[PDB]
Design a protein around this nucleic acid. Structure first.
Lengths: 536, 588, 549
DNA sequence: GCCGATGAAACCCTGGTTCGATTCTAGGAGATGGCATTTT
DNA sequence: AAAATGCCATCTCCTAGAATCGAACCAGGGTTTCATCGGC
């Protein structure tokens, strides 16, 4: 099949040994492994040395100091959308988002959020929580925890932190969270939630203003819109202007990418708004966009129902830069791997089970297969920038990491009892949140799996259950278990799937990615119980 | 014209959705399937029953890849060596020579003759200079250009070693990208003396390349743009390129640009109609096709050539798989190639429902369709052997246009035999004659192939140098040719001794006059004759003509017989190519 | 005369006889092949002939079955041992299929058939003898033949009373017309009806049409034509009638009369819930009926995802044998069901499955919570206790100038800082078996508790099931055996007819004997409608004479 | 005209064929442990 | 001398593609019953 020849990079340990490397098991030396995966760029290796010393001891939790800019371990790897002020290029007097204000009666005519209170059991507090109420965590066992659970009133399809550090009119401790909410709750096979064809119906995004120090939280806006359900909900961290909270971007069942100006209120008094016309819509004739990511402050890569990929220029959105077939079928997620040391690359995973990485400069000559999965509707992929690795699921109970170069070097991180449904990563630290269909949320350090040898993986790698949702059919009652559970990385583990209450699957989980809030994370189940915890 | 039945290929996959078909000079189809290339090996049958299954045998064509970069760490292109087991991405056969070049997934260009690697192209430099993303063959001479991640073209030329095997050596380079830029060369097209290349920033350059220039001047003919170049072609010194929503024509005499807006954002393949009088192309996508006239302003007309056939095929498929229009459906093209003569087109396609889908390899099938592009054809020197026969079966067995009053009685070079040449130059002069291409094609159309016109051209080189036929094999050969032509022979009486490893057979030279298929030794054993030299075949070490089924003595597996300058010259010159039909000989 | 061929043509001829003899021949068979073409009386020619064959890379020589060292001068001189010639498996695959074993899409079982078809030569082999000789199941043999049929030619034949295909390698295709072309009466029904339709009064003397279409040539074609007229009557494309002669009203002949000539798919899959919960939701909404895997795939994903759905659903669906751990709450059971020939899984939510298997038992109490985790250690304690140190590898230090400098561990002196389901009494392997067993017993109570297990019974059960599909003998006898094991039926052989009788255990011997007595001399083959005072068109003057008499 | 024999038609039985989904098997991938050698 | 590196064997699980198995369906041929013809 294949053979080597002796031409070799200077200063390489691999070059000195001359061993041909085809599999991760061939990298039996820890320096050769790091050198083969990350290369020999001294500035890149310096950042990995800072991640290593700053987070080696952080097996389940990391110190708040190591994510402050004054730390010697501070490594903040800003995503590509943040690298320039995009607002005047992408938006202006030609592209303002149009709203009209509506009252609560007009809202309730368009969107029927849950009216029956949820029964919630947490620690020793048993409570009926109404739609729009929160419960702060009680005096739990297993130490003091800081956070609250909010009853959002519908199926939570996605959430998104606005990762502002400070602004002329936003003080350090204040943060914003966008939550996308469906009225088509409690029904796993509802007709309106279909993936495969264009659907338009009323759904809403709720904007929350939260204080990281007090955990005071206020819903400041509800945006009613007719795009259907929304996901890949992202703030355009480059689009900032004095009169905005920020620019919020998402893909919708309409099959379009939409950008909303979230215009800041005069006061925290709640307003309902009907979105008439977004600032920007990206679409093609006779195909539906199913997923997108930023390549640039002014360009996005997106996946389609038919298995095509396009790039759009946000300054000239009518026609894409390219439109090529990459998959046989519906693209589930597209994810941008960005680096200061390599060309930007894009990963895609589809219902056909293939996971590809390619370079948008030349898809034809760069398309690399990571793996084929068993075929599935739900395959979360995120880029963890501190370890230059995509973190992803099989669509079936295994959580894995693959470096954006060395696609052969797949590292399993943890194995669950059931389908992994949500992954959370940060630009500030290597800690991975993964949510599951059984309502468990786990934390694991991915920079203890990468930045370590191959031998004794199962002994060195661990994860911790931070929370578990349960649902009682007898009581019609949700319970959240605070008690921690440690899982070692399992060996030769059988793929697992089991059926759990429709309400308890974790739909999304996202870290706050700021130095001030960077220990906050949020996660939601399908019932619409949004939980925030300031991890401390 | 009515098409041949499509060649059904089963259980083959493609990694990607670009143009994965090339059609070689000798008629071989190369499909860059995954994980191995597939070859449509050309086959001869007198009746193909209007079925293209009888023109091609499709099989796995495995190749060994040497990664010259597997001890290099990836630098700016992080996807280099990201998957370390090499496999083919692009395969182009030479438009002139027996060999093909393959680009691997890890940016190596390796040249192969049969399954054997000739050279892995490399020159000294930075890793971006050594990582290749495209290549092109010189259409006029034996050389190859590669495009690298420095945005320079590197030219490689052949030289032949002691065994007369080719070796590729680095000749020169031209930088197209700006100094310190990270633009890759993504497309190269070489047409006559004009070379065109595109960068990953979608800037396009032209050059004039010659033996008279070591490093020619490049000119930028299109500025950088976000719109990614889909396809690039040269047609009558007009550059045609496609990108999302547009086709552009650049005139290489005026450097004027004219552009036309397509009603679609699907990829359009460009198919140049090289044999029309007016300068034209077909544009073809999964959804539509057009015929474009490359006038001062691009003019659009209906594709009356190929669209009717694919429409008719899609309506039949739709009747079986998309009754009631319950599904969205598409043609999918996996490859389009002109024939080497440019008279025919091959389209590899399947038809799909847009659906949630999870295929395995055993469920894969695609069809390749062959259609004529014109009303008439000619015996092109851009094609050899079974390529002409394929172009004859397409076109429904209509003969090509031939010279006025041509007949197989016509003498090679019209009887102006270049007897003063050396014998290898002489045989080359005969094989490059126009009459020889016509006769070699017509041998594939008739029941019994004939080489009487070639045997006369040999006999005239044998009654000249009549004093130099000292050798017994050379005499037995010329005496056999004289007996076929019914002419005077140099000597009649004497003996030939011919050997194999088990059995030594003595022939009276007189016996070489008796029978045209056979010759009988002094032991009354009767032996078949060699097709080229008419000497007895005493061995299984032979090569077989796939059309005439004549056997040729394999000079490379016979150390025992003292073949003279004439018989050795014939058996060396005709070791690989059939004198009857120009087809590649099969090996026993 | 000794024929003249090329030496490589001999090696091909010998190879094409090692293939077509199941991959091996004796050395004496090689002398019988090559003696046609070379004078083997010369020792040097005999050595040359053997050398042409055995020095080929893919040919093997065996001495007493053991591979041997190809010494040509030894093999020809050595009288002490038996020699035989074979080929490599990939050569055998290449000669017969055109591809190697790895590359060929044919499959081992279809290649065992091709080896027997190849060994049969120009004589060929029939599909029934082919199944018996290879020991392959007749249920699989014809499906396997479909995948090699491009290598074969075939024609229909009757053998041991069955229509079968004679098979040969395609090289034995003859362009000549068959001496015995197989005729099926069922191909000619349109012609038979049209000849009756075009006849003067739309009526024919049946024997006259039998003679005009020349179906009298074989007792087979006679029976077949009669069965075709009987089928066209039974389906009322034609009708049988008796015509009284207008010339002599004592004369009636069996006649046949003409009567007649012969916006989108919506898929519900969503990206928000796990696929197993979406599957549970339509299994639950289907209720006590359950849902087929075919309907689940059509409604959630469409047919082109069937395989992916099946491979995924294996992880969370439970068969009744080999159940998974009882999580409680939400479980999907699967059981076999039939749609005629197709066997597929129906899916049931565990509540609906319990109501189906155990209809008499109490409906289950709904589950509450599991117990909480009982750990009380905090995150700080767990983080400190679960630390295992990493490999040293990447390091950095801060210079006196405050510049951070990278180094590998050891490259500076700086020290480290670190299987039958009970269904309440009817044992069944499928829901169709359960439905058939209950239909048999309900019919048996209806028709008086005793039945001969003949075709009349299989229609009675098929009618009661509302089955458009008709029950096979082997299917009903399968259910009857299950109903005997569960003591819901009695069954026995009736001594005189040898037919199986089934009876309800509550039905007395006097009723079973009276049932046999009532069934004896039961009248059948009864006369059809009568017609008078009208002409018959005749092909045959002898039939016209018998009507005129 | 009646009764018995033969032939003729209808009905029933048996085995192969046909079809497709599920099941099974083969081959490969991945991980750990153990042992040996190399490097620090 | 100890830790790290390298490679092999064994065990476990997965995936693709082939094989199995039930049931229906169909045709041919045997058997049984009924009708007609011939003989008494």
């Amino acid at each position: 099949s294949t053979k080597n020849m002796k031409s070799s990079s200077p200063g390489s340990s691999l070059g000195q040994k001359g061993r041909p490397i085809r599999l991760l098991k061939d990298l039996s030396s820890a320096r050769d492994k790091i050198e083969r995966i990350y290369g020999l760029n001294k500035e890149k290796l310096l950042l990995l040395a800072k991640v290593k010393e700053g987070f080696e001891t952080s097996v389940f939790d990391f110190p708040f100091k190591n994510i402050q800019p004054d730390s010697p371990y501070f490594v903040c790897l800003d995503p590509p959308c943040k690298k320039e002020s995009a607002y005047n290029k992408v938006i202006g007097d030609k592209n303002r988002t149009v709203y009209h204000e509506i009252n609560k009666t007009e809202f309730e005519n368009m969107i029927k959020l849950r009216t029956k209170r949820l029964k919630l059991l947490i620690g020793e507090v048993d409570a009926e929580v109404s739609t729009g109420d929160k419960i702060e965590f009680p005096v739990l066992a297993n130490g003091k925890r800081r956070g609250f659970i909010y009853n959002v009133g519908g199926l939570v399809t996605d959430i998104a932190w606005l990762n502002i550090e400070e602004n002329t009119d936003i003080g350090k401790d204040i943060q914003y969270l966008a939550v996308a909410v469906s009225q088509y709750m409690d029904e796993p096979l509802n007709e309106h939630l279909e993936m495969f064809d264009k659907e338009k119906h009323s759904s809403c995004i709720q904007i929350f203003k939260m204080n990281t120090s007090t955990l005071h939280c206020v819903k400041v806006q509800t945006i009613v819109h007719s795009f259907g359900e929304v996901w890949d909900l992202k703030w355009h961290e480059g689009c900032h202007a004095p009169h905005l909270v920020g620019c919020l971007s998402f893909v919708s069942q309409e099959g379009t990418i939409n950008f909303l100006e979230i215009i800041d209120n005069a006061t925290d008094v709640h307003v309902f708004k009907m979105c008439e016309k977004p600032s920007l819509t990206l679409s093609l004739a006779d195909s539906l966009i199913t997923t997108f990511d930023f390549l640039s402050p002014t360009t996005v890569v997106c996946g389609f129902k038919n298995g095509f990929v396009a790039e759009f220029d946000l300054t000239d959105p009518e026609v894409p830069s390219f439109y090529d077939q990459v998959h046989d079928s519906y693209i589930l997620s597209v994810s941008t791997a960005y680096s200061d040391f390599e060309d930007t690359v894009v990963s895609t995973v589809a219902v056909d089970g293939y996971f590809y990485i390619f370079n948008p400069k030349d898809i034809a000559t760069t398309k690399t297969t990571v793996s084929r999965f068993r075929g599935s509707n739900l395959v979360p992929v995120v880029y963890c920038p501190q370890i230059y690795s995509y973190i992803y699921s099989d669509g079936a109970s295994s959580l894995r990491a693959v470096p954006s170069r060395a696609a052969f070097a797949v590292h399993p991180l943890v194995s669950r009892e059931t389908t992994i449904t949500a992954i959370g990563v940060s630009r500030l630290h290597p800690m991975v949140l993964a949510g599951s269909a059984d309502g468990s949320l786990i934390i694991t350090n991915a920079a203890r799996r990468l930045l370590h040898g191959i031998k004794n993986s199962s002994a060195t790698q661990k994860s911790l259950r931070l929370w578990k949702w349960d649902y009682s059919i007898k009581d019609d009652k949700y319970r959240i278990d605070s008690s921690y559970e440690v899982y070692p990385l399992t060996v030769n583990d059988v793929s697992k799937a089991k059926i759990d209450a429709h309400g308890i699957n974790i739909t999304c989980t996202k870290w706050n990615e700021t130095s001030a809030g960077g220990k906050c994370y949020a996660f939601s189940n399908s019932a619409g119980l949004l939980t925030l915890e300031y991890l401390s | 014209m009515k098409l041949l039945k499509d060649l059904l290929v089963d259980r083959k996959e493609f990694e990607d959705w670009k143009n994965n078909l090339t059609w070689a000079r000798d008629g071989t189809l190369y499909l860059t399937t995954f994980p191995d290339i597939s070859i449509g090996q050309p086959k001869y049958a007198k009746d193909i029953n209007c079925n293209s299954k009888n023109l091609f045998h499709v099989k796995e064509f495995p190749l060994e890849f040497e990664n010259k970069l597997d001890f290099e760490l990836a630098q700016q292109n992080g996807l280099l060596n990201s998957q370390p087991v090499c496999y083919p991405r692009v395969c182009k056969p030479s438009p002139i020579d027996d060999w093909m070049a393959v680009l691997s997934n890890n940016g190596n260009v390796s040249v192969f003759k049969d399954n054997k690697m000739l050279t892995n192209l490399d020159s000294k430099g930075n890793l971006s200079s050594r990582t290749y993303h495209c290549f092109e063959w010189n259409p006029i001479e034996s050389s190859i250009v590669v495009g690298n991640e420095d945005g320079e073209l590197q030219f490689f030329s052949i030289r032949k070693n002691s065994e007369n095997t080719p070796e590729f050596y680095f000749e020169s380079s031209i930088r197209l990208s700006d100094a310190g830029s990270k633009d890759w060369v993504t497309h190269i097209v070489w047409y006559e003396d004009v070379l065109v290349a595109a960068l990953s920033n979608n800037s396009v350059f032209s050059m004039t390349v010659s033996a008279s220039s070591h490093q020619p001047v490049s000119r930028m003919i299109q500025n950088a743009s976000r719109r990614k170049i889909t396809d690039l072609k040269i047609v009558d010194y007009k550059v045609v390129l496609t990108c999302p929503g547009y086709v552009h024509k650049i005139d290489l005499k005026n450097y004027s640009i004219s552009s036309l807006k397509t009603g679609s954002l699907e990829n359009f393949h460009i198919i140049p109609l090289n044999h029309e009088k007016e300068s034209t192309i077909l544009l073809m996508s999964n959804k539509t096709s057009y015929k474009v006239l490359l006038e001062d302003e691009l003019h659009v007309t209906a594709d009356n050539i190929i669209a009717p056939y694919l429409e008719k095929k899609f309506k039949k498929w739709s009747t079986i798989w998309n009754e009631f229009n319950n599904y969205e459906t598409t043609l999918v093209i996996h490859g389009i190639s002109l024939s080497p003569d440019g008279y025919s087109i091959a389209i590899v396609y399947d038809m799909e429902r847009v659906a949630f889908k999870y295929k395995i390899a055993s469920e894969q099938s695609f069809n390749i369709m062959f259609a004529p592009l014109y009303h008439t054809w000619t015996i092109s020197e851009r094609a050899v052997g079974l390529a002409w026969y394929q172009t004859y079966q397409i076109y429904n067995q209509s003969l090509p246009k031939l010279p006025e009053n041509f007949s197989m009685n016509k003498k090679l070079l019209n009887g102006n035999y270049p007897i003063s040449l050396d014998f290898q130059s002489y045989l080359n002069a005969l094989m490059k004659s126009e009459e020889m291409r016509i006769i070699m094609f017509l041998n594939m159309t008739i029941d019994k192939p004939s080489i009487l016109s070639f045997l006369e051209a040999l006999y005239e080189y044998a009654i000249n140098k009549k004093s130099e036929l000292t050798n017994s094999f050379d005499l037995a050969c010329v005496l056999s040719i004289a007996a076929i032509l019914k002419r005077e022979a140099p000597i009649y009486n004497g003996t030939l001794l011919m050997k194999n490893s088990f059995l030594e057979e003595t022939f009276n030279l007189e016996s070489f006059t008796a029978d045209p298929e056979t010759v009988t030794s002094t032991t009354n054993n009767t032996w078949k004759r060699c097709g080229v030299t008419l000497l007895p075949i005493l061995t299984t070490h032979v090569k077989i003509c796939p059309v005439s089924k004549q056997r040729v003595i394999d000079i490379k597996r016979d150390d025992l017989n003292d073949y003279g300058w004439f018989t050795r010259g014939l058996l060396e010159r005709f070791n690989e190519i059939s004198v009857y039909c120009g087809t590649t000989l099969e090996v026993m | 005369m000794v024929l003249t061929i090329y030496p490589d043509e001999l090696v091909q001829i010998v190879s094409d006889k090692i293939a077509s003899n199941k991959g091996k021949i004796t050395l004496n068979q090689l002398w019988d092949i090559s003696g046609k073409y070379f004078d083997l009386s010369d020792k040097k020619v005999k050595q040359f002939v053997l050398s042409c064959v055995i020095l080929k890379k893919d040919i093997e020589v065996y001495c007493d079955g053991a591979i041997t060292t190809k010494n040509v001068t030894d093999i020809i001189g050595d009288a002490n041992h038996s020699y035989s010639v074979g080929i490599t498996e990939d050569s055998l695959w290449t000669l017969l299929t055109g591809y190697t074993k790895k590359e060929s899409t044919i499959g081992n079982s279809a290649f065992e058939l091709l080896l027997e078809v190849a060994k049969s030569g120009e004589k060929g082999i029939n599909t029934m003898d082919l199944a018996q000789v290879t020991g392959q199941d007749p249920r699989s043999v014809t499906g396997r033949i479909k995948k090699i049929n491009h290598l074969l030619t075939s024609s229909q034949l009757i053998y041991k009373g069955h229509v079968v295909k004679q098979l040969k390698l395609k090289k034995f295709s003859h362009d000549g017309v068959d001496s015995n072309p197989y005729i099926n009466i069922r191909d000619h029904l349109a012609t038979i009806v049209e000849v009756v339709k075009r006849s003067k009064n739309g009526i024919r003397q049946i024997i006259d049409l039998k003679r005009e279409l020349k179906f009298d040539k074989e007792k087979r074609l006679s029976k077949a034509f009669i069965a075709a007229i009987a089928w066209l009557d039974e389906k009322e494309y034609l009708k049988k009638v008796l015509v009284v002669s207008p010339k002599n009203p004592a004369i009636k002949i069996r006649c046949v009369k003409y009567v007649k000539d012969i916006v989108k798919n919506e898929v519900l899959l969503n990206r928000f819930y796990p696929l197993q919960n979406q599957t549970y939701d339509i299994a639950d909404k289907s209720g006590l009926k359950g849902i087929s895997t075919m309907d689940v795939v059509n409604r959630i994903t469409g047919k082109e995802f069937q395989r992916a759905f099946t491979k995924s659903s294996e992880y969370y669906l439970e068969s009744v044998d080999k159940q998974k751990e009882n999580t409680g709450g939400y479980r999907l059971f699967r059981i076999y069901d039939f749609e005629g020939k197709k066997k597929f899984f129906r899916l049931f939510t565990a509540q609906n499955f319990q109501k189906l298997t155990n209809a008499e038992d109490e409906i289950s109490v709904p589950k509450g919570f599991d117990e909480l985790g009982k750990s009380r250690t905090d995150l700080k304690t767990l983080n400190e206790d679960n630390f295992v140190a990493l490999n040293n590898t990447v390091r950095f230090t801060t210079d006196s100038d405050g510049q951070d400098i990278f180094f590998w561990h050891g490259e500076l002196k700086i020290p480290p800082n670190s299987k039958v389901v009970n269904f309440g009494g009817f044992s069944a392997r499928s829901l169709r078996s359960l439905q058939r067993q209950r239909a048999i017993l309900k019919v048996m109570n209806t028709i008086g508790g005793v039945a001969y297990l003949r075709e009349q019974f299989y229609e009675s059960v098929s009618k009661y099931m509302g089955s458009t599909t008709t029950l096979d003998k082997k299917t009903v006898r399968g259910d009857v055996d299950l109903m005997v094991e569960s003591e819901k039926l009695g069954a026995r052989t009736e001594p005189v007819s040898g037919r199986k009788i089934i009876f309800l255990p509550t039905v007395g011997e006097d009723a079973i004997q009276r049932y046999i007595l009532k069934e004896k001399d039961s009248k059948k083959a009864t006369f059809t409608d009568v017609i008078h005072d009208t002409e018959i068109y005749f092909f045959d003057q002898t039939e016209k004479n018998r009507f005129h008499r």
